[PDB]
Amino acid sequence: EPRXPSHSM
Amino acid sequence: MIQRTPKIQVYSRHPAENGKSNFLNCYVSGFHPSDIEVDLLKNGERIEKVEHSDLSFSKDWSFYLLYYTEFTPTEKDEYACRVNHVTLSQPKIVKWDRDM
Amino acid sequence: GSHSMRYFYTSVSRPGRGEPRFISVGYVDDTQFVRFDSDAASPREEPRAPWIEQEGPEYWDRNTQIYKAQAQTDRESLRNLRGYYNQSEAGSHTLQSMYGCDVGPDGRLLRGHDQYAYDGKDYIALNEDLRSWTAADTAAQITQRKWEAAREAEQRRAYLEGECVEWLRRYLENGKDKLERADPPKTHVTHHPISDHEATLRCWALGFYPAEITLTWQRDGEDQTQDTELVETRPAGDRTFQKWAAVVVPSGEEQRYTCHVQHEGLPKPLTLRWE
Ligand code: NA
């Protein structure tokens, strides 16, 4: 399953 | 910005036998950026309903796609793949050879 | 056996034509098992391998929401990175993401991965310690300071050591022979006269999984490295792979040549000849 969203760069 | 020229191979899923259902593949790989145009040609004419794999990439970030269609090879029918990409000054056409 | 899980994201801006396109694919080893495309009619995570179809609706729902949120996050990242590099707001740019876990036979984490490329160039990467970043340039150092303050590495580490490992173990249990048992190549040698004095021998490997393979031509049991034409390994379209190796030989000397095939699916390395 995918990772929960990152902070933006 | 990085620009990498696509590698192209055109080939059948199974060894060709005239009159037997098969898949015609055009594998484009090693390219950047991802914008690319790939057509499968039968006797010079664009084949419709050609499907492709989901956009993926290699460890060096270069993209790859498989374009494919179901087809029945014959003696006379000529197949090819036509690729357009920002790195190519003209479209690249690679002919299907059943021995490669 | 040892195994890996990987997710691959591609975001491509198109200023003036709407929000960037976001595509994700997931792999276990060399098998693609999911996709998401932000330009689909009703974007959702979709199965691409039979063994993932058994996951319940809560799985597909959670993942779909993640991809939709990540697409918006990548759109913000692309805005920030054209700012960092002082680039035109009219042009199309690419943000790629690649993450996942390598496990050994016991299913324990060997190595975690979380890394990014901007316009095809490495930008920032989580180090092997899963605690620190390597930035390619002063732009990527802006991202690094942001992610250090936000404790991003701890979020990545928790996933890589936890969900990544646990879900890869699950997919291996449910994929069984499709993922754990290598499929050996079907092999044959073909012969193509060029002239009265030269012929091509071509060694074929078809229908093999995983993609890793070695094909070598030998003359009297010595590798013909400098004289072998080797095509890049290519997908058949049915989850298996193909490769061939060819040598041009003098007519009547074909008996001196053998093709050597090494693949995980073979009981032992194969020696083939024209027959
Ligand atoms: Na072009």
Author numbering:
A (entry chain E): 1 to 9
B (entry chain B): 0 to 99
C (entry chain A): 1 to 275
Per the authors:
Here we describe a mechanism by which an HLA-B*0702-specific acute myeloid leukemia phosphoneoantigen, pMLL747–755 (EPR(pS)PSHSM), is recognized by a cognate T cell receptor named TCR27, a candidate for cancer immunotherapy. Here we describe the crystal structures for TCR27 and for HLA-B*0702 in complex with pMLL747–755 or similar peptides. Our data show that non-covalent interactions between the epitope phosphate group and TCR27 are crucial for TCR specificity.
To exclude the influence of different crystallization conditions on protein conformation, we generated fully isomorphous (having the same space group and very similar unit cell parameters) complexes between HLA-B*0702 and the following peptides: MLL747–755, pMLL747–755, DOT1L998–1006, pDOT1L998–1006, E7P-MLL747–755 and OSE-MLL747–755. Similarly, replacement of phosphoserine with phosphonate analog (E7P) resulted in low T cell activation, though it was the highest activation level among all the phosphomimetics tested. Substitution of phosphate with phosphonate (E7P-MLL747–755) or sulfate (OSE-MLL747–755) sharply weakened the pMHC-TCR27 interaction (KD = 47 μM and KD > 200 μM, respectively). Substitution of pSer-P4 in pMLL747–755 with any other residue tested was deleterious for both T cell activation and TCR-pMHC ternary complex stability, respectively. It is notable that among the phosphomimetics, the phosphonate analog E7P-MLL747–755 induced the highest T cell activation and supported the highest affinity between pMHC and TCR27 with KD = 47 μM (as compared to KD = 1.9 μM for pMLL747–755). Moreover, the phosphonate chemical structure is the most similar to that of phosphate, differing only by the replacement of the methylene group (E7P-MLL747–755) with a bridging oxygen Oγ (pMLL747–755). In contrast, neither phosphonate nor sulfate maintain contacts with HLA atoms in the corresponding pMHC structures, they are fully exposed to solvent and surrounded by water. Moreover, the structures with E7P-MLL747–755 and OSE-MLL747–755 peptides were nearly identical to that with the wild-type peptide MLL747–755, including exactly the same positions for the Arg62 and Ile66 side chains. However, in the structure with phosphonate (E7P-MLL747–755) the same atomic position is occupied by the nonpolar methylene group not supporting hydrogen bonds, and thus the guanidine group of Arg62 remains about 4 Å away from the Cγ atom of the E7P residue. In conclusion, replacement of serine P4 with phosphoserine but not with phosphomimetics leads to unique conformational changes at the ligand-HLA interface.
